[PDB]
C-alpha cells in the first residue's frame, strides 16, 4: 500500500487558505481510515483529523479534511504563522491483503508574514581556539523575514569555502527566522589576515558587521 | 496520561537493541493499539508495527520489519520494541503512540562504527571595543562532537527567555557543531552555558562575561 502525498512543499501567505493532497494505491480500510498530522521540529506528530474528516478534540476548526476511498485532501483556512510545520497523511488498510498502514511522504508548509529586516552580530574566536590549530568565527542574523543571503569577506576578499549555515524554524508569533553562519579557517590562515566581515543581505539592503583580529 | 520512550543509544552495525515505551496515568489492561513509528534525520514518518493490548492481542508489522523486529507488552505499563541486525538504514528517532493519538517525545538510535568524541566549548562575546548599552547577546560555540545530540541549557535551566539554539551542522571534518546565544540585560548576569553530550558522558560549563575594557 503506497500513499502518495503532494505537494512536497508549499509557501503561502498569512490569511490565505492552503490545500494538500493524498492519493492511495488501494482503498483505505472501510473507505475512510485516513488521518492527518502536524509535526514541528523536535516534536512528535499531533493528530489533527481522523476517519477522513473528523476533528480531533481540541483542534481548531480551520483545519478540515475530506475525501474517501483512494483520494483525500486537507485544507487549512486562515493560515497563521503558528501553522508553519510539516504535515503528514496516514492510511490504515485491510491487514489481510497487504500491510496494515502507510504514511505519505509529507508536505512542508512555509508561511509568509510581514517583512522584518535582520540585526546582525559577529563573534571573534575565543582565545582558546587558535591553540587547537583551527578557528571558527560566528555570525548571527536575528529575527528576519523573508530569507537572506550571507557573504563572508577577509581583507576585502570574498570567501568561497569553509562556510556553514544553520537556520531556526519560523517563529510561531511573527514568522521570522534566525540564522547562524560560521567561517572556519586554520590558525595559520587566521593569523595572516586583519579584517573579518559578515554581510547579510535582504533584497538590495545589507547589514554589515566586522572586527579586526588584533583588536579583540 | 502520557508516554515516554527510552533505550536509544549509539550501537555498532550488526547489533541488537531493545527500546521501551512507558505509560503514565493509565495502564495496558485496557484496549489500545500501541504502535512504533520511526523517522530518519530530515526524513518522513515510517510505520514499524503495532500490538493490541485488548482481546486478540494481535501483533502486526510492516513487511520490511516482519521477522527482524518484535513488539510485545511486557507489563501493564510497558511495551518494548526489540531490534536485530541493525544497519545505518535503521538510524532514526523512534516514537511510540497510543491509537496514533497520544505520542511520546521519541528516543534516538544511531547505528555507526564511528567513535564518540566530546565537544569543545568556547564562549561568544562582542569584540572588546563594541559600544554600550542596555542589552548584550552572549553565547557558546559547541564544536567537534560525535555523534548527535548535545543539549544546551543556560544557568542550569533557570535562564529560558531570549535563548536561540541553532540546529547542528555536520562540518567538513565529519564532526558536528552548533551555537547557542542568549540576550541578557547588559553589564549584569555572568551567564553560564551547560553543555551535555550523553554519548561521551560529559557535561561542560562555560561562564561568559560581557566584554569590558
Amino acid at each position: 500500500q503506497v500513499l502518495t502525498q503532494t505537494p512536497s512543499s508549499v509557501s503561502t501567505a498569512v490569511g490565505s487558505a492552503v490545500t494538500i493532497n493524498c492519493q492511495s494505491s488501494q482503498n483505505v480500510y472501510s473507505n475512510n481510515n485516513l488521518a492527518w498530522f502536524q509535526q514541528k521540529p523536535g516534536q512528535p506528530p499531533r493528530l489533527l483529523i481522523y476517519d477522513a474528516s473528523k476533528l480531533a478534540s481540541g483542534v481548531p476548526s480551520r483545519f478540515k479534511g475530506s475525501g474517501s476511498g483512494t483520494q483525500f485532501t486537507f485544507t487549512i483556512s486562515d493560515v497563521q504563522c503558528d501553522d508553519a510545520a510539516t504535515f503528514y497523511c496516514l492510511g490504515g488498510y485491510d491487514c489481510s491483503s497487504g500491510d496494515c498502514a502507510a504514511f505519505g511522504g509529507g508536505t512542508e508548509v512555509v508561511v509568509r508574514g510581514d517583512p522584518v529586516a535582520p540585526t546582525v552580530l559577529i563573534f571573534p574566536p575565543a582565545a582558546d581556539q587558535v591553540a587547537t590549530g583551527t578557528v571558527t568565527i560566528v555570525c548571527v542574523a536575528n529575527k528576519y523575514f523573508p530569507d537572506v543571503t550571507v557573504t563572508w569577506e577577509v581583507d576585502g576578499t570574498t570567501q568561497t569555502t569553509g562556510i556553514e549555515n544553520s537556520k531556526t524554524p519560523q517563529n510561531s508569533a511573527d514568522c521570522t527566522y534566525n540564522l547562524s553562519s560560521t567561517l572556519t579557517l586554520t590558525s595559520t590562515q587566521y593569523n595572516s589576515h586583519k579584517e573579518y566581515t559578515c554581510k547579510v543581505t535582504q533584497g538590495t539592503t545589507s547589514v554589515v558587521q566586522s572586527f579586526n583580529r588584533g583588536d579583540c | 496520561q502520557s508516554l515516554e520512550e527510552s533505550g536509544g543509544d549509539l550501537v555498532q552495525p550488526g547489533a541488537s537493541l531493545t527500546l521501551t515505551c512507558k505509560a503514565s496515568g493509565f495502564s495496558f489492561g485496557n484496549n489500545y493499539d500501541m504502535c512504533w513509528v520511526r523517522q530518519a534525520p530530515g526524513k518522513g514518518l515510517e510505520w514499524i508495527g503495532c500490538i493490541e493490548t485488548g482481546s486478540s492481542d494481535s501483533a502486526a508489522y510492516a513487511t520490511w520489519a516482519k521477522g527482524r523486529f518484535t513488539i510485545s507488552k511486557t507489563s501493564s505499563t510497558t511495551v518494548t520494541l526489540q531490534m536485530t541486525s541493525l544497519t545505518a538504514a535503521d538510524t532514526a528517532t523512534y516514537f511510540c503512540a497510543r491509537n496514533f493519538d497520544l505520542w511520546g517525545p521519541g528516543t534516538l538510535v544511531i547505528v555507526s562504527s564511528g567513535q564518540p568524541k566530546a565537544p569543545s566549548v568556547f564562549p561568544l562575546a562582542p569584540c572588546c571595543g563594541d559600544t554600550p548599552s542596555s542589552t548584550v547577546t552572549l553565547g557558546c560555540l559547541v564544536k567537534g562532537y560525535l555523534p548527535e545530540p548535545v543539549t544546551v541549557t543556560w544557568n542550569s535551566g533557570t535562564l529560558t527567555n531570549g535563548v536561540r539554539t541553532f540546529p547542528s551542522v555536520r562540518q567538513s571534518s565529519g564532526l558536528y557543531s552548533l551555537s547557542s546565544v542568549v540576550s541578557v540585560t547588559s553589564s549584569s548576569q555572568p551567564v553560564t552555558c551547560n553543555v551535555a553530550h550523553p554519548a561521551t558522558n560529559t557535561k561542560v560549563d562555560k561562564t561568559v562575561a560581557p566584554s569590558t575594557c
Binding site: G92, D94, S96 | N99
Partner: peptide, 10 residues
C-alpha cells in the same frame, strides 16, 4: 481479530 490499525478515540 485485527482488521486494520486503530486511529483516534476508541
Amino acid at each position: 481479530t485485527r482488521k486494520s490499525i486503530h486511529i483516534g478515540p476508541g
